[PDB]
Amino acid sequence: IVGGTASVRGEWPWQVTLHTTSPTQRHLCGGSIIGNQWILTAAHCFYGVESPKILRVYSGILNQSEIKEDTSFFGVQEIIIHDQYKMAESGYDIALLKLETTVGYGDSQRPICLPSKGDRNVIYTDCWVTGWGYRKLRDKIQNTLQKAKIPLVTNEECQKRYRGHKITHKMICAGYREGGKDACKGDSGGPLSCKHNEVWHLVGITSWGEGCAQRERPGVYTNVVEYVDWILEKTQAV
Ligand SMILES: COC(=O)Nc1ccc2c(c1)N[C@@H](C(=O)OC)CCCC[C@H](NC(=O)/C=C/c1cc(Cl)ccc1-n1cnnn1)c1ncc-2[nH]1
């Protein structure tokens, strides 16, 4: 996260750190708890990931230093990638992780509500992007979870900012015209969380951008409201 500040423990209890074991263990992506065995993240995170056996989901983490060999994690049973996904810049950048075991909810780890189909007609004015990603293009994974409040941008304005791309309504953008606050490398898959009528909603999944926090280059997020039926299809399968 660029232009952010340190989060407080338990502030974003749905935020997870997804680690990979190949070749050595490291943070791979962010993610969000959406159900007791479901993590919602970005499909692009799994580029070259051949098996779910190399993945480790850590919840209830403020600092990466809490993770050692003795730290408990959730194993991944299945990686579910939207089958229209080609690349982040083309959309459908959404994946589900089915956990091998159930998440026990508490003040340290709990689910974020998905947006309502009725909430498609709402204006969110309190949106935050979180993650352990870089503070600048050439940086390193941060120890402490960072947060940054960023305004949502209309599809029209975001299309103006990305000549040469097709910004669809399945994407949602967020950023300041002057830049300065944004997601960056290592933040992808994580949530764009918006508070509405005292309830937090998973409005976006950190996807892509041209550089980090640049003027007139908003961050592009998977517009979660447009995938509610897809998530329910995968998680409520008979
Ligand atoms: C010690 O641990 C370690 O250093 N881990 C680690 C470090 C960096 C990475 C990463 C893991 N993730 C990628 C990876 O592991 O590649 C091998 C996969 C995932 C590859 C893509 C990912 N994209 C983002 O995260 C966000 C982009 C993005 C999103 C918005 Cl909304 C706005 C601007 C953006 N940026 C434009 N340019 N940069 N950001 C990423 N790129 C490097 C990484 N992630």
Q: State yes or no: is 70 an active-site residue.
A: no
Atom of ligand 1 nearest to the CA of 48: 17
Diameter of the chain by CA atoms?
49
* Ligand 1 proximity of 192 Cβ (cutoff 6 Å): no
Q: Say if residue 83 is in the same domain as residue 118.
A: no
Q: Say if residue 142 is in the same domain as residue 213.
A: yes
- Distance (angstroms) between ligand 1 centre and the Cα of 139 equals 11
* Ligand 1 proximity of 234 Cβ (cutoff 6 Å): no
Amino acid at 218: P
- Distance (angstroms) between ligand 1 centre and the Cα of 238 equals 35
Environment class of 181 (CB within 10 Å of its CB; exposed 0-12, middle 13-18, buried 19+): buried
155 lies in which domain range? 1-12+112-226
Q: Say if residue 102 is in the same domain as residue 181.
A: no
Residue 99: which residues within 8 A CB-CB, separation 6 or more? 37, 38, 39, 57, 74, 75, 76, 77
Q: Say if residue 8 is in the same domain as residue 125.
A: yes
Q: State yes or no: is 44 an active-site residue.
A: yes
Final resolution, Å: 2.1
* Ligand 1 proximity of 183 Cβ (cutoff 6 Å): yes
Q: Please give the method by which this entry was determined.
A: X-ray
Pairing of strands 15-20, 26-35: antiparallel
Q: Is the dihedral of CA 115, 116, 117, 121 positive or negative?
A: negative
